[PDB]
Enzyme design. Sequence first.
Site, PDB file in Angstrom:
ATOM      1  N   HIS A 172       0.806  -1.232   0.000  1.00  0.00           N
ATOM      2  CA  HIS A 172       0.000   0.000   0.000  1.00  0.00           C
ATOM      3  C   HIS A 172       0.846   1.294   0.000  1.00  0.00           C
ATOM      4  O   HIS A 172       2.021   1.290   0.379  1.00  0.00           O
ATOM      5  CB  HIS A 172      -0.851   0.002   1.264  1.00  0.00           C
ATOM      6  CG  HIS A 172      -0.060   0.350   2.483  1.00  0.00           C
ATOM      7  ND1 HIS A 172       0.709  -0.578   3.156  1.00  0.00           N
ATOM      8  CD2 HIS A 172       0.147   1.542   3.106  1.00  0.00           C
ATOM      9  CE1 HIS A 172       1.351   0.029   4.148  1.00  0.00           C
ATOM     10  NE2 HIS A 172       1.031   1.313   4.136  1.00  0.00           N
ATOM     11  N   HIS A 175       5.602   6.616  -1.936  1.00  0.00           N
ATOM     12  CA  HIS A 175       6.378   5.355  -1.905  1.00  0.00           C
ATOM     13  C   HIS A 175       5.489   4.138  -1.490  1.00  0.00           C
ATOM     14  O   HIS A 175       4.541   4.318  -0.729  1.00  0.00           O
ATOM     15  CB  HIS A 175       7.530   5.488  -0.863  1.00  0.00           C
ATOM     16  CG  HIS A 175       8.597   6.498  -1.207  1.00  0.00           C
ATOM     17  ND1 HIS A 175       9.663   6.759  -0.369  1.00  0.00           N
ATOM     18  CD2 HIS A 175       8.790   7.272  -2.312  1.00  0.00           C
ATOM     19  CE1 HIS A 175      10.464   7.645  -0.940  1.00  0.00           C
ATOM     20  NE2 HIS A 175       9.960   7.973  -2.118  1.00  0.00           N
TER      21      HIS A 175
END
Length: 183
Positions: free
Chosen positions: A39, A130
Amino acid sequence: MRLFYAVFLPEEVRAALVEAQTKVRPFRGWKPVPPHQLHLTLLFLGERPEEELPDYLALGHRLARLEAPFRARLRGTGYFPNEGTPRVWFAKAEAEGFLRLAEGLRAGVEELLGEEAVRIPGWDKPFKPHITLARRKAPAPRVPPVLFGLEWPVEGFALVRSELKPKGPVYTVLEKFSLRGEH
């Protein structure tokens, strides 16, 4: 509750990333993130009192209705720290939309907490879209960069609770929000 806002990913994205993780199986020092936990975090909140749940929920619904689904691109990998023993291996993703949702939430959290929001762990870090691939639990080497070039539709995000348990962190989605904004 230790809470954070995040974007979960669709099948083709998790698969490209799971194929990426592959370069790291020969190295036992690397702990790969379970695919269903893969995620991108938009804002980590740390330990928050239950009394604040509704506010984080309302904040999610508010932001969700103001912003439209947007396309993101997966693009290359990286490590933190950038030089020396790495702590994390992640994929870089990009899109204005991630930054807009991250700003929208930091804003809402400030309104609600004022000065107290500074004490939130890592609150001062500049947002970097990220997606963690693995974490360095023991000696392990960097692996060459992995280029992705994969676009996908981001349609919403969630408010998630994390609990540290044995095997590691267990995630519970308190709520999902759908991007429905006109903007």
